[PDB]
Structure 1
Amino acid sequence: MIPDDEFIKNPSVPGPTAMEVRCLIMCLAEPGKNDVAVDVGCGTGGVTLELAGRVRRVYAIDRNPEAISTTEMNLQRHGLGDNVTLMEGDAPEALCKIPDIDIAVVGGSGGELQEILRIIKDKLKPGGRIIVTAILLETKFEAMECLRDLGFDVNITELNIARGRALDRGTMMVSRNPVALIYTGV
């Protein structure tokens, strides 16, 4: 997996998602080379990158132009992007212009989460997977609720990662903020 260090950040663009989380999302999404995926709120490009290398097509969406810019840069740094359709603008509008999906990774809460999820449920091919990355306590709840309301079997996994930082004095554990992955049964 591309570690967080090899990502070109941008002060106004959140990310990249911790490799440990990207790790897990990849396993939950269980990409197939014929799967069409959508990464809503692609940020620095973390998930898009990982998906780019394992699925047929990836539609990366984000309101923030700098994010599409950063994701673009990062795809190029890692020579991916041939199969990645970057998309500027409002997630719900963008999502309508997309084909049906097998995998949906929704990071960007962007308020309109419930709307995005409804849209996604409608474009989800049978056996599709939705994975919502929640940073805000509200998103954890809202995602759980929507997914259940859209008739999905919802699961949730909260990841608390700590990496050691070598100091002269020794190895200190440094925490990433908790990240929850709300995902629908396959």
Structure 2
Amino acid sequence: MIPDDEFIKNPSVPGPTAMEVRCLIMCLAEPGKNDVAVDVGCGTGGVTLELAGRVRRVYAIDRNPEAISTTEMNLQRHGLGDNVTLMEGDAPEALCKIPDIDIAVVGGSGGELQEILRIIKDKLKPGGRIIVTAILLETKFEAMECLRDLGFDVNITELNIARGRALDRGTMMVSRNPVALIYTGV
């Protein structure tokens, strides 16, 4: 899988999502070659890239134009993006112009989370999966609540990752900030 350092960063744009988290998002998403996915809040483009290479069509969204831009760039350095539709703007609105989806990953919920999830429910093909990435405590609560209220069986997994940094004296463990994944039954 593509490591975090082989991504082009932009200060105003957050990400890339830790590879270990991306790794898991894919396990949960169960990507299929005929699937249509939407990555709300694509940011650096980490999820989009991984999805890009495993599904039929990927619809990437972000309010931040810098994000849309960083994702396009990262799509290129890796040679992907033909099956990717980039959409700059407000998520709810962009979501209404998309076909139905088999997979929905919601990252930077930009505080319109509840609205985004309702819409996504309405377009979720039978057997579809939703995976919300949470950094803020509040998102972890809101996601769980919304999905539950939308009738899904909800689950949550928090990941605390530490990677070793080679120093001259030895190997010190460096932490990543905790990331939660709220996901619906398959």
Same fold (TM over 0.5): yes
Instruction: Give the C-alpha shift of residue 80 in structure 1.
Output: 0.4
> Which digits, 9 at most, give the CA deviation of each residue in 1:33-87, with x for residues without a partner?
0000000000000000000000000000000000000000000111000000000
Secondary structure at the counterpart of residue 38 of structure 1: strand
Structure 1 residue aligned with 2:12: 12
Q: Over residues 131-171 of structure 1, what are the superposed CA-to-partner deviations in whole Å (9 max), with x where a residue is unaligned? A: 00000000000000000010000000000000000011100
Secondary structure at the aligned position of 2:14 is classed as coil
Which secondary structure does the structure 2 equivalent of 1:138 belong to? helix
- What's the secondary structure of 1:180's corresponding residue? strand
SS at match of 2:58: strand
Aligned to 2:133: 133
Deviation at 1:109, TM superposition (A): 1.9
The 3-state SS of whatever aligns with 1:160 is strand
- What is the rounded CA distance, in whole Å, between the counterparts of 1:115 and 1:171 in structure 2? 45
Q: Distance in 1 between matches of 2:58 and 2:104?
A: 9
Mark the runs of 5 or more structure 2 residues left unpaired by the alignment.
none
Secondary structure of 1:105's aligned partner: strand
Report the equivalent of 1:52.
Answer: 52
Whole-angstrom CA distance in 1 between matches of 2:44 and 2:108: 12
Residue 94 of structure 1 and its aligned partner are, at CA, apart by 0.3
Query: What RMSD in Å do the two structures reach over aligned CA positions?
Result: 0.4
Secondary structure of residue in 2 paired with 1:8: coil
- Structure 1 residue 176: deviation in Å? 0.3
Match of 1:94, SS state, is helix
Q: Aligned residue for 1:143?
A: 143
Q: What is the CA–CA distance in structure 1 between the aligned matches of 2:123 and 2:100, rounded to whole Å?
A: 5
Q: Distance in 2 between matches of 1:21 and 1:174?
A: 16
TM-score, normalised to structure 2, is 1.00
SS of 1:164's partner is strand
Q: Deviations over 1:73-109 (max 9, x none)?
A: 0001110000000001000000001000000000012
- Residue matched to 1:174: 174
Distance in 2, matches of 1:158 and 1:125, equals: 27
Task: Give 1:127 deviation, angstroms.
Answer: 0.6
- Aligned-pair identity (%): 100
Q: CA separation in 1, counterparts of 2:169 and 2:119?
A: 52
State the distance in 2 between where 1:132 and 1:179 align.
10
Q: 3-state SS of the aligned residue for 2:8?
A: coil
User: Which runs of structure 2 are paired with 1:1-186 in the superposition (5 Å)?
Assistant: 1-186=1-186
